[PDB]
Amino acid sequence: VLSEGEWQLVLHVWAKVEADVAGHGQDIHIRLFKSHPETLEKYDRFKHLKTEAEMKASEDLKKHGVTVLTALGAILKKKGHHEAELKPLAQSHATKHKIPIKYLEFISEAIIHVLHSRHPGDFGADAQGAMNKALELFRKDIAAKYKELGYQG
């Protein structure tokens, strides 16, 4: 559970993300793929990408990042009351894409990295802590939904 103050820090920095969703999405995916190359294997439509420049130039990857961040943003804005938004995500990621919880941990780390790289003045220790809690809640709830569907994290 996050306090109201923690949710406000989360949404304050999220507003910065919303000023350039595509750009943030690209940086997050690139960071994810560079730090954890095994994750790229899960994307049949992106695994052909060989260099950082190719990744940045991919319209398809850029569009996907907007889809990803739009979904995450919709979840965060519910401040924990996110069952309706989270359920379909768990369904697809468990039963179609087969994304282990550890990979959600990897992308969470990428999100923190990119947000701190771009907005240090609005993403200090307390804001990082809040976002970490929000992403931990997201992962915890999706893991529970995974199990409900018969998929082990």
Query: Which range, of 10-18, 19-27, 42-50, 125-133, touches ligand HEM by CB under 6 A?
Result: 42-50
Options 9, 10, 49, 72; binder of ligand HEM; rule CB under 6 A: 72
Strands (E), 41-110: none
Considering the complex, what minimum distance in angstroms separates the CB of residue 126 from ligand HEM? 22
Considering the complex, what minimum distance in angstroms separates the CB of residue 67 from ligand HEM? 5
Residues in the chain: 153
Is the Cβ–Cβ distance between 65 and 22 less than 8 Å? yes
Using CB under 6 A as the criterion, what x/- string covers residues 1-40 for binding ligand HEM?
Answer: --------------------------------------x-
Q: Contacts from 69-74 at CB under 8 Å and sequence distance 24+?
A: 69/17, 69/21, 69/24, 69/25, 69/28, 70/21, 72/138, 73/14, 73/17, 73/18
Rounded Cα distance, 85 and 81, in Å: 9
Q: Is 47 in the site for ligand HEM (CB under 6 A)?
A: no
User: CA dist 100 to 22, 28, 95, 138, 151, Å?
Assistant: 25, 18, 11, 14, 9
Using CB under 6 A as the criterion, what x/- string covers residues 88-107 for binding ligand HEM?
Answer: -x--xx---x-x---xx--x
In the bound state with ligand HEM, the residue whose beta carbon lies nearer, of 4 and 44, is 44
The residues of the shown chain that bind ligand HEM, judged by CB under 6 A, are: 39, 42-43, 45, 67-68, 71-72, 89, 92-93, 97, 99, 103-104, 107
